[PDB]
Amino acid sequence: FTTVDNINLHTQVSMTYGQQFGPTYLDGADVTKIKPHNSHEKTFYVLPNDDTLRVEAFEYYHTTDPSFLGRYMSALNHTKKWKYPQVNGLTSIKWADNNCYLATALLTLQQIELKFNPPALQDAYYRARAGEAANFCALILAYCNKTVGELGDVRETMSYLFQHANLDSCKRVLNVVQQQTTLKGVEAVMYMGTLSYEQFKKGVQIPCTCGATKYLVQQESPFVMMSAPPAQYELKHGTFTCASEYTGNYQCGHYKHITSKETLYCIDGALLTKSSEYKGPITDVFYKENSYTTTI
Ligand SMILES: Cc1ccc(OCCN(C)C)cc1C(=O)N[C@H](C)c1cc(-c2cnn(C)c2)cc(-c2cncs2)c1
Ligand SMILES: [Cl-]
Ligand SMILES: [Cl-]
Ligand SMILES: [Cl-]
Ligand SMILES: [Zn+2]
Ligand SMILES: [Zn+2]
Ligand SMILES: [Zn+2]
Ligand SMILES: [Zn+2]
Ligand SMILES: [Zn+2]
């Protein structure tokens, strides 16, 4: 049977699989060169060749890029080989093929409230919290055009993931000095420049178009992401939801994830380290907000 979304299966009935069905993938491995066998007979992924499959493909993945299915299947061939151990109630990834940014992003995703627009992302996202995050990690690579082993940046991975999610209800009003602007969607949840969410509310010096300082006026969202170039940062118990640590040179460095439970927990792959106070190089800090109205 040939399916493009795995929730809409179509029946089909020597000649290589590629000449019969086009590009054919079984369990994330190309069987285009492979011939039919009595063992193969099952369910095979195929790039859509008719409008019925093209419509079903968009309904599940929300993309029409034909290379998407091939890159997703190729990424899935590696992710299912990875082990996904659960540490401190969170589904992480055992480090393999430079996935330190994937695991840090996966740990951060389970702790922020997010609804994905494509059903493929959402179904795998629920499966990811359950412990089966193979399809979810492969989809992340496919939507981000990143390949397995490629060096990935967490705040960029989040940026593309936030674009494929419902952030319409998120909103941010910023005033720079008196001129205030409104940011909606991904811009409302992300800011590059500083890690302290308090500093963002108090004001940050920004280049004036005339010459200014930038302060937050209103924030209606379920969370806020604060990004900055990697620098030594002090993390206190209860001030942050989670953070991402970067230790190394540009692109080459390793990614580590710190979360704030009853004590600060630090997750590197499958390893977990606990400390009451943690000071280290941090590039992204995540904060939980529901509504903010400035006192200014
Ligand atoms: C792992 C990785 C993979 C891919 C990747 O791609 C980026 C290019 N992209 C456009 C495709 C980046 C990274 C990556 O090293 N990220 C860390 C967080 C980082 C960031 C920044 C940074 C971000 N903004 N500014 C203004 C500075 C600086 C450094 C360092 C500089 N000197 C020593 S460390 C490290
Ligand atoms: Cl879309
Ligand atoms: Cl989408
Ligand atoms: Cl918080
Ligand atoms: Zn969409
Ligand atoms: Zn691999
Ligand atoms: Zn001015
Ligand atoms: Zn404490
Ligand atoms: Zn790494």
UniProtKB/Swiss-Prot annotation:
Binding site for Zn(2+) 4: 208, 210
Compartments, as annotated in UniProt: Host endoplasmic reticulum membrane
Mechanisms controlling activity: Inhibited in vitro by GRL-0617.
Membrane topology: Multi-pass membrane protein
Listed result of changing residue 100 to S: Complete loss of PL-pro activity
Catalysed reaction equations from the record: Thiol-dependent hydrolysis of ester, thioester, amide, peptide and isopeptide bonds formed by the C-terminal Gly of ubiquitin (a 76-residue protein attached to proteins as an intracellular targeting signal)
UniProt effect for mutating residue 214 to Q: In strain: Gamma/P.1
Impact after mutating residue 64 to L: Increased cleavage of ubiquitin in vitro; no effect on ISG15 cleavage in vitro
Subunit composition and interactions: May form homohexamers. Interacts with N protein.
Annotated function: Responsible for the cleavages located at the N-terminus of the replicase polyprotein. Participates together with nsp4 in the assembly of virally-induced cytoplasmic double-membrane vesicles necessary for viral replication. Antagonizes innate immune induction of type I interferon by blocking the phosphorylation, dimerization and subsequent nuclear translocation of host IRF3. Also prevents host NF-kappa-B signaling. In addition, PL-PRO possesses a deubiquitinating/deISGylating activity and processes both 'Lys-48'- and 'Lys-63'-linked polyubiquitin chains from cellular substrates.
Protein name stated in the entry: Papain-like protease nsp3
